[PDB]
Each structure stands twice: as structure tokens, then as C-alpha cells.
């Protein structure tokens, strides 16, 4: 077509401005002093140059699509890694909870063993106490029979019973008070965290 500024054909090419113009634009101050050629002169050169540029751009676009696929696969791999780490943390906390359960069971069994020992000791002492109470009751019954019956009943072997009562040492029960300890885990792990 023709030029918009002057009206002549656009058959020229400015090496400096890279714009097609007319002959009137070449002499004006707008394109003064530049080097001007014909459009048909540089056609093949710029054609092969742009062909090589197209080759480079095709290769670079292939590389860029490969890069896109790479970043997609990477974010997939990272979500997988995060899932792995979450499962790992949950498993570690479960391990801690299990060993805590075991320690609790150990402490409970220790306390039950201590209770068993204390109870068996107190049961033996209570057996001794009830035996001595029954002995007292038996002696009381014998003295009653002595005081109600015959004179020969009253006097036969009376010194033996008197001496048996003279050695009346009453037995005290076994006891213990607040001489035990059973400490659990102190919240020092909270400071450790």
C-alpha cells in the first residue's frame, strides 16, 4: 500500500529504524542520515535469520514444557513426602504412648505388691491378737468355774493358774505409718520439649 504520512509507496527499508517508508520520509528530518535499502534486497537474509530464530524458539519451547512437567512432578513428590513425615510423627507419638502405658502398669503392680505385703503382715498380727483374746476368754472361763464349783476344784492347781496370770504380758500389734514412697513421672519432659 501507500504511505500514511506522505502518500507514496513503501518500497524502502531503514537499517537503523527497521521501518518501511517512502522516498519523502528518507529526506525529512525523521529518517535523516540513516542508511536505506530496498525491501527486496534484505528479504532472503532476514528470512533465513528468522528461520534460525524459529528453530531456536521451537527448541526452547520444548525445554520449557519439559520444565513445566518437572515442577508438576516435583509438587506431587513433595505432597508424598509430607504424607510420609506425618505418618512418621504419628507413629513416634504412638510409640511414646505405648511405653507410657507400660510404665503405668509397672507402677500400679508395684503399689499392689506393697499393699499385699502390708496386708499379709497385718493379717498375721491380727491372728496373734485374736489368739491372745481367745486365751484371755479361756482364762476368764476357767476362773469362773473355779469360783463357782467345789472347794477341791477351787484349790487344785490354783498356784499354777495364779502364776500363769502373773506372767500376763499383753502383746501389742505391729504397725507402720507413712514410711513409703511412690513417685511417678515429674513433668520435666515439658521443659525438655
Amino acid at each position: 500500500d501507500h504511505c500514511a504520512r506522505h502518500g507514496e509507496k513503501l518500497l524502502l527499508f531503514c537499517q537503523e529504524d527497521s521501518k518501511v517508508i517512502c522516498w519523502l520520509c528518507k529526506d525529512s528530518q525523521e529518517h535523516r542520515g540513516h542508511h536505506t535499502f530496498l525491501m527486496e534486497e534484505v528479504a532472503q537474509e532476514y528470512h533465513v535469520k528468522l528461520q534460525t530464530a524459529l528453530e531456536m524458539l521451537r527448541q526452547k519451547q520444548q525445554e520449557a514444557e519439559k520444565l513445566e512437567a518437572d515442577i508438576r512432578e516435583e509438587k506431587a513428590s513433595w505432597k508424598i513426602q509430607i504424607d510420609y513425615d506425618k505418618t512418621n510423627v504419628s507413629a513416634d507419638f504412638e510409640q511414646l504412648r505405648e511405653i507410657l502405658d507400660w510404665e503405668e502398669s509397672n507402677e500400679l503392680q508395684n503399689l499392689e505388691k506393697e499393699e499385699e505385703d502390708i496386708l499379709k503382715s497385718l493379717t498375721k498380727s491380727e491372728t496373734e491378737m485374736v489368739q491372745q483374746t481367745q486365751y484371755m476368754r479361756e482364762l476368764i472361763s476357767e476362773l469362773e468355774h473355779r469360783l463357782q464349783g467345789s472347794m477341791m476344784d477351787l484349790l487344785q492347781g490354783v498356784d499354777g493358774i495364779i502364776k500363769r496370770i502373773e506372767n500376763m504380758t499383753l502383746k501389742k500389734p505391729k504397725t507402720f505409718h507413712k514410711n513409703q514412697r511412690r513417685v511417678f513421672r515429674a513433668p520435666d519432659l515439658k521443659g525438655m520439649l
Binding site: 510409640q95 507400660w102 502398669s105 509397672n106 503392680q109
Partner: protein, 114 residues
Amino acid sequence: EKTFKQRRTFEQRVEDVRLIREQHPTKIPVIIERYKGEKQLPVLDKTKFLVPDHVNMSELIKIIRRRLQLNANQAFFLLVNGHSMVSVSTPISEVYESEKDEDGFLYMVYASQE
């Protein structure tokens, strides 16, 4: 309701046994659960027991009877690995060395009727 072997994997159970043996070497770890189809007895809250070595089966049986709150007349069966060997006089160390599981724990079950 999942059993012990269903709540934890095999390697996890072996690691638990190792940690317990490192912490309490003088004690034996025992897992005690109710029978699959026994109804007369309830389910205990606790599942794990650390039993001293010198202790015999009698102390473990009486501990289980006290935890279950049972009178002396009513009896129950305590099977090891699914087969009875309640030689009450034997020490628990021999029971552990003879009937322990592959992972390292000692599994027992309590039942009663039939």
C-alpha cells in the same frame, strides 16, 4: 475392638520388647486379653503386665483374679498361646523361655465356661 497384634505391627512389637528389656531387664512383659467368645467374664482395662523373674504363675493368676474381682470358689482358665500349661509352681521365667511369641511378648488368655 482390635487385639494387641492388630493395633501394632510385628516390627513395632519387637521394638517394644527390646525397649522394655532395656528398661526393665529383671521383668517379663506379658500381654493378657479375654477369650474371643467368652461371655461370663468382663474385659479388663489394663492389657500389659511386667512380672518379676523369680515370681511363679501363682502370683500372676491371683493378680488376674483380683483385677477381675472374683471370689475364691469361682475358677477360670488362663491359657498361654492358646494351650493350657498352668503348672502353677513353675517360675514365669521358664514359661517365658518356653512359650514366648516370635516377637518377644508373652501372650495369655482368660476364659471360664466350656
